[PDB]
Amino acid sequence: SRPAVLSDIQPYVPRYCGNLANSDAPETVNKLSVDSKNELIDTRTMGLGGADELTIHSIASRMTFWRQFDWPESAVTDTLLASMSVQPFCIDTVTASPVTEIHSTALAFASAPFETWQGSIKFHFKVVCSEYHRGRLRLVYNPLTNNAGPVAFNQVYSTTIDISNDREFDYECKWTDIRAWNACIGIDGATSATFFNTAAAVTGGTPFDNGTLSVYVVNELATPSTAAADVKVQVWVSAGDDFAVAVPGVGLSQLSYFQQQ
Amino acid sequence: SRPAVLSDIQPYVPRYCGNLANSDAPETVNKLSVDSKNELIDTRTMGLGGADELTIHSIASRMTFWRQFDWPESAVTDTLLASMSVQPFCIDTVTASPVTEIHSTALAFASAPFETWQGSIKFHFKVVCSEYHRGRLRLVYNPLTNNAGPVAFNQVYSTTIDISNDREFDYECKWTDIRAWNACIGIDGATSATFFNTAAAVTGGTPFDNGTLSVYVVNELATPSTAAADVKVQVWVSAGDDFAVAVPGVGLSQLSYFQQQ
Amino acid sequence: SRPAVLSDIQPYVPRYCGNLANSDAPETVNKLSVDSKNELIDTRTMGLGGAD
Amino acid sequence: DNSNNPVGGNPIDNYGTEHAPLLKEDNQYLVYQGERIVSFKDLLRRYQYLNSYWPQETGSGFRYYTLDSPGMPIYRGWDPNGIDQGQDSTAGNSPYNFCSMTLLNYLAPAFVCQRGSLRHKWVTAGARVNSTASVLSATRHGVLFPLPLAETAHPLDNALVGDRRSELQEMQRSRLNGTAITPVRLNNTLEIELPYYSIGQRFHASRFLDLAGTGDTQGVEIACEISDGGNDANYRLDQFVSVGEDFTLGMFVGAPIMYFYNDPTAT
Amino acid sequence: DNSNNPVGGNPIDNYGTEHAPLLKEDNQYLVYQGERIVSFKDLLRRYQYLNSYWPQETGSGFRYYTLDSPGMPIYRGWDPNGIDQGQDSTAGNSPYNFCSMTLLNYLAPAFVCQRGSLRHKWVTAGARVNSTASVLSATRHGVLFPLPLAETAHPLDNALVGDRRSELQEMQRSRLNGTAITPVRLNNTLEIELPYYSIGQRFHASRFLDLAGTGDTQGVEIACEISDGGNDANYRLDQFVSVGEDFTLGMFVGAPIMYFYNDPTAT
Amino acid sequence: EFKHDGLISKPASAVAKAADALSMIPYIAPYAKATSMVADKIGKIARIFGY
Amino acid sequence: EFKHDGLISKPASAVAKAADALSMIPYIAPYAKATSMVADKIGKIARIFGY
Amino acid sequence: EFKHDGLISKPASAVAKAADALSMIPYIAPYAKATSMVADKIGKIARIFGY
Amino acid sequence: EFKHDGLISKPASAVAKAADALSMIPYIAPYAKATSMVADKIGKIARIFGY
Amino acid sequence: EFKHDGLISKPASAVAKAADALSMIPYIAPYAKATSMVADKIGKIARIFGY
């Protein structure tokens, strides 16, 4: 109370509710502890190894089984076995009349809160067969869609793997789109669209995906006897090295972990 | 909660609405993104060259076609062909009884939000004729107005261009006014006044313009045959190097991009 | 929103009407111009000699 | 010999000895103006009043007014898709916007491209009842579907608490998108900025006039509680628009066709 | 020869010369997005609206509303132990939560372990009567007994002052645990953080969905005064949840089974 | 850029006698932002162009 | 860490041209906190991982 | 000029013993403003004339 | 002591690895206050005893 | 004098062991004010006399 404060009048704006949109601004939060700097650690004191696993690329790069198809005896050259859409949202549903279960890949789990995606998608194909089952598969990449008959060896991107030396193999579909970022359908929107057809070719070319990847037969399946051979192929799916997501959105506002009742 | 805060009481004034008049004060704005420093660039990533084009002098210096007049066979020495007012607001209207279109020069576009202007105006004259059409034009600058008859070669500023060597030529009308800044009529106010007359001389000397520029005939149009020759001259208009605008005002509060209904 | 602000609670007194008696204190005045430092001069640009 | 130049240019002897003499006057703005205006990007960062919005015109009871507005200000005149209705020249009626002509609305249809963040202020003037503790909130929409300018009311005065919660979950405020809230009794001003998110888009059409019937990809939902009692009939929201810092316009392709007329009688 | 690898991996020649070309575009987010999102731990620190709570639904007279809520947000769908009641597919009724699906609720049942502090905001929107000077208060519970989500009213308008004091001593606000108070007429926002105290526990079950019927060991009691007069029927509390700075999740064991459906009619 | 009390250190509106370079064109570097860029890379007076 | 005006000194959201190390894994020291730790012990750009 | 807490560094009202130069005339340079000018170009005590 | 923003410069609550001297007794000088004293005269970690 | 946060740098109330010069008389210079004067011209402890 002796002198007079001659500092300048300093303007201010009150922020009662704070800053609840940005992810990096410090907060004026009354922590309900004794020490103001009360803080634990985030390490291998839970029994684990110590790796940060809330990275988007650490969750999405996990190779997860997605679907399975078969390669019949009656398949001949230029027969489509499966066709699938190049995108993150690789789910599979189990309906049972009141409930509808949605089983999602880690690639589809880690990309649901977002509205744009880009990058490469890795598909791991796994042929279950004996040593005496021989043939050639063929992996068409087509940015739009495949025609209703045979697909020519020119005018598409293809690989033609022999399954004698490589029964299991992965194929990385890079970014070849006219945009930089495609849209995200969400797990909510992927449950109504066809993304794995195995009877015809799926419809790509949408603003939501990066085209389509299809499996054809080049050489027929050779058999060691007269027994009926039921050969299957497994499709596992992961994120490639380019894979990025952006625009946090409303993709998971309608999802739930409780069944439909 | 251990010690007591013995800093001075510091006076403040709350600013709830902010500062919405000045153009340089920082703002306390809650940006609705994840990163507080979310910012794109402003460059040639749109397909362009990378030049800053929101400069007033970059918009206003573009040479834009304004009007067109003719130079008849019956024109003789000291015949006025056109007279125009030296100012930024060079527009042209198309009426069709409910609607009234206003087509404005980039010089008139870039000077509508302001209330004062100064500087030089550049007029580009472009004579459309064959190689056998010869004569002399004459460009009077008069700060007030030209008399109803012939204008003398003394007592005005004039040039007398021969159109044999220079069929296209521009003429820069500098600042010769009793003020430093003239007023801006606006595009709203330029639609009711006469700024290009081509039958008499326009009225300058107002506080809104920098005088008047007129075109007279010195030597008659020479013709190669007995055919009727319809020679025209085009007036293009731009800002000179001196051109400046100030006092942001209410010049575009009544304008619209939707027709009159 | 990552850390917690651990600066001290700083006391203040609001001054809504300002300081309208003293002749030397700076003011928090919203000047109605484009430039915040909008200022002319006070000299012989009025036709005069330049004396205060 | 410089005789069909698309930009012209052939300087003939004019009436001055000294070329461009007003650039050599250094202390000119110490005498007349006090400041110099060189760019529009400096002048586009002054806020300007766009339009006002009355929340007690949509629902009934105590409810939650929500307004889906574009991030870019709507245009000033006789729309075919206008949010208001004016008396035209045939003594009839036509759609009309009673909004202001901002500098952004003026400059944007003369350029091809457009990109950048856009800043808003929501001011909440008028009258109000003494029993209010509402929160004004701004929350952004997605960038796939542009919603047009629309007004919705969500009722909050049901007998069931669950049927109030189901109305609070129909709102964009409940979502993972960026949200700014404030109390009206304490601050009543948002001061938000809409960033330029896009589905692989480098720019958008700067010459797109139909923002009130289509919207853009920077839309925002503004939300505020309202009651049906009197003296809330004068409660309104004022929108002030301006331009963020990463904002740019494309190539200049000339001024559009303009029209000059006053506001008609609102019917 | 890499032929039963549990993670797969055998790169066959695909259709690109350049491997992973989108990592070599350094200035990509100067063109399209403005920002890059790499981790979820950065994105979990955005607050998101969880649920609203109406204090004039529990007691009568002038009283003190108290709400025992978990520190972790409750889950979104058809609980067997839900706090609300919706109309199901058999045209009957079933318990249901009308809360939002936050990013924390999304990410947590896909991990085994969970540890860290959790941040809350309590916003207090709606209407109110002019005769209020209430104090909103948050106070933490013990870490031995997790209390479920419950609502209680303590009457304060008795004739005896001692029987008012005995109601103020039935509250967790009167205890040695950490308490944050604020006046509703002046700030109306708490912004608290619940630390991770534990009885020798290194983590807890991140796949535990029944938070509304059991609670967790980071529960908090929220307390606010309410009167029985009208215009307080619209007085409510909004909960915004987020994640503290010592927060971590354990090992990823896959996404759970998900379900997609809109909110039913609240009955 | 984002600095504490940046309006004090500007010439900010006006004459600033060496700020009569209004006839100069601003050069934008190939991925230049507006904030932590050309206002410090062109010169002192690049804040009259809005940077 | 707990410092005065720490958001000004971040690159904080974005490109920050040398911040294209998104393909790097964060290493956590055996008893590392989040605040006064790996955001200064990995590098300048360890704040895009949330530290 | 526009500086932070400029009233503290003034003599600001009064005697300031060397401020008995009230009999001196203030000289204004030919395009001098009032703010970033003669209050620092005449002397320390040019703030009793209002500059 | 009475200093500006003293909570930032504390370890203030916790582990602070060298703050495992909880088995040490605090020594109080014969006329020591709590504020401008033993929190700086014992060591850095004398603030977990309440000083 | 008029300085920013002057109460922090005082001993301000009390013992301040060298402040047992209460038996000393304050000397006032012939035109000394109270503010920018004898509180700095007598000694450190001239603030218990009210200066």
> Which pair of structure tokens corresponds to residue B133?
């059409």
Please state, in angstroms and rounded to a whole number, the distance separating the CA atoms of residues A170 and A214.
13
Is chain F adjacent to chain I, meaning 3+ CB pairs within 8 angstroms? no
Q: Which one-letter DSSP state was computed for residue D76? A: -
Contact residues of F toward G, CB < 8 A: 2-4, 31
A220 touches chain D (CB under 8 A): no
Alpha helix stretches (DSSP H) within chain D = 40-43, 103-107, 162-168
The residue type at A171: Y
Please state, in angstroms and rounded to a whole number, the distance separating the CA atoms of residues A60 and A196.
20
Element containing residue A188 per DSSP (H, E): helix A187-190
Is chain A adjacent to chain E, meaning 3+ CB pairs within 8 angstroms? yes
Q: Which chains have 3 or more CB–CB distances shorter than 8 Å to chain G? A: A, B, C, E, F, I
Q: Where are the beta strands (DSSP E) in A97-153?
A: 99-104, 114-118, 121-128, 134-142
J35 touches chain A (CB under 8 A): yes
Q: Give which of D97, D93, D83, D66 is closest to D179, Cα–Cα.
A: D66
Q: Give which of A112, A91, A124 is closest to A194, Cα–Cα.
A: A91
How long is chain J?
A: 51
Q: Give which of E87, E38, E107, E139 is closest to E253, Cα–Cα.
A: E107
Q: Which one-letter DSSP state was computed for residue A7? A: P
Contact by Cβ (8 Å): A176, E17: no
SS3 readout for chain H: CCCCCCCCCCCCCCCCHHHCCCCCCCECCCCCCCCCCCCCCCCCCCCCCCC
> Which pair of structure tokens corresponds to residue E70?
């978990």
A175 touches chain E (CB under 8 A): yes
For this PDB entry, the determination method is cryo-EM
Please state, in angstroms and rounded to a whole number, the distance separating the CA atoms of residues B72 and E148.
98
Buried b (16+ CB within 10 A) or exposed e, A83-103: bbbbbbbbbbeeeeeeebebb
> Which pair of structure tokens corresponds to residue A40?
């634990």
**Residues of chain C neighbouring I6 (CB-CB closer than 8 A):** 8
Contacts of A211 by beta carbon, 8 Å cutoff, 6+ apart: A85, A86, A141, A142, A143, A144, A173, A176, A177, A204, A205
Q: What angle do CA E79, E83, E87 make, to 5 degrees?
A: 65
Is chain J adjacent to chain B, meaning 3+ CB pairs within 8 angstroms? yes
CB–CB of I3 and J5 under 8 A? no
Please state, in angstroms and rounded to a whole number, the distance separating the CA atoms of residues A42 and A45.
8
> Which pair of structure tokens corresponds to residue D70?
């574009």
Bridge partners (DSSP) listed for residue B139 = B215
Burial of residue H36 (CB within 10 Å: 0-12, 13-18, 19+) is: middle
Contact by Cβ (8 Å): H32, C43: yes
Contact by Cβ (8 Å): B193, B185: yes
Closest Cα in chain D, distance from residue F16 (Å):
9
Please state, in angstroms and rounded to a whole number, the distance separating the CA atoms of residues B46 and D205.
12
Which of I7, I8, I10, I13 to mutate to probe the A interface, most A CBs <10 Å?
I13
Element containing residue A57 per DSSP (H, E): helix A56-60
How many CB pairs (< 8 A) connect F and G? 5
Closest Cα in chain C, distance from residue F8 (Å):
9
How many CB pairs (< 8 A) connect H and J? 5
Please state, in angstroms and rounded to a whole number, the distance separating the CA atoms of residues A83 and D126.
61
SS3 readout for D234-245: CCCEEEEEEECC
Please state, in angstroms and rounded to a whole number, the distance separating the CA atoms of residues H21 and H28.
17
> Which pair of structure tokens corresponds to residue B102?
């206003």
Contact by Cβ (8 Å): E23, G23: yes
Q: Which of B33, B43, B45 sits opposite E35 (nearest CB)?
A: B33
Q: Which one-letter DSSP state was computed for residue B8? A: P
Strands D257-260, B99-104: parallel, antiparallel or unpaired by DSSP? Answer: antiparallel
How many CB pairs (< 8 A) connect C and F? 17
**Residues of chain G neighbouring C6 (CB-CB closer than 8 A):** 2
Q: Give which of E231, E169, E225 is closest to E55, Cα–Cα.
A: E225
CB–CB of C14 and B10 under 8 A? no
Q: Where are the beta strands (DSSP E) in chain D?
A: 48-53, 63-69, 84-86, 94-96, 113-115, 118-122, 135-140, 150-155, 179-183, 192-194, 204-205, 220-226, 237-243, 248-249, 257-260
Domain span at residue A81 reads 1-261
Closest Cα in chain C, distance from residue D255 (Å):
25
Is chain J adjacent to chain D, meaning 3+ CB pairs within 8 angstroms? no
Element containing residue B188 per DSSP (H, E): helix B187-190
Contact by Cβ (8 Å): E243, E119: yes
Burial of residue B75 (CB within 10 Å: 0-12, 13-18, 19+) is: middle
Please state, in angstroms and rounded to a whole number, the distance separating the CA atoms of residues E137 and A32.
12
Q: Which residue has the tokens 């916007």?
A: D97
**Residues of chain C neighbouring F11 (CB-CB closer than 8 A):** 37
> Which pair of structure tokens corresponds to residue B223?
């013709």
Please state, in angstroms and rounded to a whole number, the distance separating the CA atoms of residues D204 and G4.
40
D258 touches chain B (CB under 8 A): yes
**Residues of chain I neighbouring A38 (CB-CB closer than 8 A):** 13-14
CA dist list (Å): C10 to B50, E243, E267, H4, I36: 48, 27, 50, 19, 21
Give resolution, Å, one decimal: 3.1
* DSSP sequence for B211-241: -EEEEEEEEEEE-SSSS---EEEEEEEEE-T
How long is chain B?
A: 261
Q: Which residue has the tokens 């709830």?
A: B16
Burial of residue A141 (CB within 10 Å: 0-12, 13-18, 19+) is: buried
Burial of residue E131 (CB within 10 Å: 0-12, 13-18, 19+) is: exposed
Contact residues of B toward F, CB < 8 A: 23-26, 37, 39-45, 50-52, 54-55, 57-58, 241, 244
- Domain tally, chain E: 1
Contacts of D23 by beta carbon, 8 Å cutoff, 6+ apart: B241, B242, F20, F22, F23
CB–CB of G17 and E27 under 8 A? yes
Contact by Cβ (8 Å): B39, E34: yes
**Residues of chain B neighbouring A12 (CB-CB closer than 8 A):** 12-15
Q: Which one-letter DSSP state was computed for residue A107? A: H
Which of B27, B52, B53, B56 to mutate to probe the F interface, most F CBs <10 Å?
B52
CB–CB of F33 and E30 under 8 A? yes
CA dist list (Å): D137 to A168, D140, D155: 54, 10, 17
Please state, in angstroms and rounded to a whole number, the distance separating the CA atoms of residues A203 and D198.
24
Please state, in angstroms and rounded to a whole number, the distance separating the CA atoms of residues D250 and A171.
41
Strands B134-142, B212-222: parallel, antiparallel or unpaired by DSSP? Answer: antiparallel
CA dist list (Å): B212 to B73, B156, B157, D123: 25, 11, 11, 48
Please state, in angstroms and rounded to a whole number, the distance separating the CA atoms of residues H29 and H40.
12
Contacts of G10 by beta carbon, 8 Å cutoff, 6+ apart: A24, B37, G47
Find residues 170-189 of chain D whose CB sits inside 8 Å of chain A. 172, 174-183, 186-187
Q: Which of G14, G19, G49 sits opposite E42 (nearest CB)?
A: G49
* DSSP sequence for chain E: --SS-TT---B---S-SSSSGGGS-GGGTTTTTSS---BHHHHTTS-EEEEEE-STTS--SSEEEEEEE-SSPPP-S--SS-SEEE--TTSS-EEE------HHHHHGGGBSEEE--EEEEE---S---SS---EEEEEE--SSSPPPSEEEEEE---S-SHHHHHHHTSSGGGSSS-EEEEETTTT----EEE----SS-S-EETT---TTTS--TT-EEEEEEE-SSTTSTT--EEEEEEE-TT-EE--B----EEEE-----B-
**Residues of chain G neighbouring B39 (CB-CB closer than 8 A):** 13-14
Strands C12-14, B10-14: parallel, antiparallel or unpaired by DSSP? Answer: parallel
Please state, in angstroms and rounded to a whole number, the distance separating the CA atoms of residues D205 and D214.
13
CB–CB of B30 and A22 under 8 A? yes
Longest Cα–Cα distance of chain A, Å, equals 109
What's the half-sphere exposure (Cβ side, CA atoms, 13 Å) at D8? Answer: 25
CA dist list (Å): B54 to D112, D163, E38, E156, F50: 13, 52, 35, 65, 10
Which of A5, A9, A12 to mutate to probe the C interface, most C CBs <10 Å?
A9
Contact by Cβ (8 Å): E126, D63: no
Closest Cα in chain G, distance from residue C45 (Å):
44
Q: Which one-letter DSSP state was computed for residue A60? A: H
CB–CB of B33 and E34 under 8 A? yes
Strands B168-173, B121-128: parallel, antiparallel or unpaired by DSSP? Answer: antiparallel
Burial of residue B153 (CB within 10 Å: 0-12, 13-18, 19+) is: exposed
Strand order of the β-sheet with B121-128 is B64-71, B231-239, B121-128, B168-173
Q: Which residue has the tokens 């303590």?
A: E154
Bridge partners (DSSP) listed for residue D39 = B55
Contacts of C31 by beta carbon, 8 Å cutoff, 6+ apart: B21, B22, C38
Report the residue of chain C nearest F8, measured CA to CA. C37
Contact by Cβ (8 Å): B22, F47: no
3-state secondary structure of B100: strand
> Which pair of structure tokens corresponds to residue A73?
């005896």
- Domain tally, chain A: 1
Q: Which residue has the tokens 């919660």?
A: D165
CA dist list (Å): A226 to A42, A43, B5, B176: 60, 58, 93, 107
Contact by Cβ (8 Å): D108, D114: yes
CB–CB of H34 and C39 under 8 A? yes
Q: Give which of H24, H20, H51 is closest to H10, Cα–Cα.
A: H51
What's the half-sphere exposure (Cβ side, CA atoms, 13 Å) at D66? Answer: 24
Please state, in angstroms and rounded to a whole number, the distance separating the CA atoms of residues B61 and B81.
26
CA dist list (Å): G23 to B204, E20, E38, E78, G26: 70, 11, 9, 40, 10
Which of E46, E52, E190, E239 to mutate to probe the D interface, most D CBs <10 Å?
E52
Report the residue of chain H nearest F4, measured CA to CA. H4
How many CB pairs (< 8 A) connect D and E? 103
Domain span at residue D169 reads 1-267
Please state, in angstroms and rounded to a whole number, the distance separating the CA atoms of residues D84 and F3.
44
Rg, Å, chain I Cα set? 11
CB–CB of H26 and C52 under 8 A? yes
Contact by Cβ (8 Å): E222, E138: yes
**Residues of chain G neighbouring E34 (CB-CB closer than 8 A):** 13-14
CB–CB of F22 and D38 under 8 A? yes
**Residues of chain C neighbouring I7 (CB-CB closer than 8 A):** 6-8
> Which pair of structure tokens corresponds to residue E157?
């308008």
Please state, in angstroms and rounded to a whole number, the distance separating the CA atoms of residues J34 and J49.
11
What's the half-sphere exposure (Cβ side, CA atoms, 13 Å) at B82? Answer: 20
CB–CB of I14 and A34 under 8 A? no
> In Å, how far from its chain's centre is CA A110?
8
**Residues of chain B neighbouring I50 (CB-CB closer than 8 A):** 2
Q: Give which of B53, D253, B251, B50 is closest to F49, Cα–Cα.
A: B53
**Residues of chain A neighbouring C27 (CB-CB closer than 8 A):** 9
3-state secondary structure of D163: helix
